[PDB]
Amino acid sequence: SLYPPPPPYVKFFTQSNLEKLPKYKEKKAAE
Amino acid sequence: NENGETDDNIETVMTQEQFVKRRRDMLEHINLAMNESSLALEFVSLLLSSVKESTGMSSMSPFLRKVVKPSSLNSDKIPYVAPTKKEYIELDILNKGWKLQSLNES
């Protein structure tokens, strides 16, 4: 399979992390 | 005419790969339903509760090695009502006209 797999970063895209995102983005505002 | 209708009724064919692959299709596609009728024989062990139930149960060799009488139910005659009375159930009867239509198209 010379077709690559999706980027390793995919594992982080859980529904639990998605829920935590809005608050995290806020807190951040305060490589 | 009769001989020729009997010829078509002799399965007869001289096909290479053509005849070969087709009969393999029968094997697998028939086998599937054979095997799924065996889930049907597993509902048999599901009875348990009776000696005649054990008889039905031994139907699986794995039942021969999975001793338990295992399962139990309650009452949702209400849920029978929901199955029958739902707007979904009225609608589903439309799946009856729909499949039946495509069957008539066939």
Partner: protein, 146 residues
Amino acid sequence: FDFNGVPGQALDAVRMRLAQLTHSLRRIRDEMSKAELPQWYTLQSQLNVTLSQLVSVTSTLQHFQETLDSTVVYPLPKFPTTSHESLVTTLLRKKNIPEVDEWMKYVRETSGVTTALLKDEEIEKLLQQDREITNWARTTFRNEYG
């Protein structure tokens, strides 16, 4: 007295017809493998024609206690022996549809309907009934065959 009389009234009745459809399929399955020779086109229709009949009785046996059984709806609790080897339990207690549900959609979408609701839908019912009444016309024509 410890535990309960749960369900399964006509369960025996389902099992019997569940078996006959199993038994007729299984035997056809065994032969299906000796593709060395197919049994005589008479023979296969005798086995595959009463093998389909077997599933009519098995089809109907399901509806006859059809109120009773979907109502019963038992999910399993057992010996923890069932818990080891796991899946067998997921497998053996599971209802679904196969790749099957898909040509069920092909068929459903093949009809002329889908999201337009109740009033227009009740009307379609009366119309299909009119089709069945125009089918009675078959009764009239059958008299002619006389």
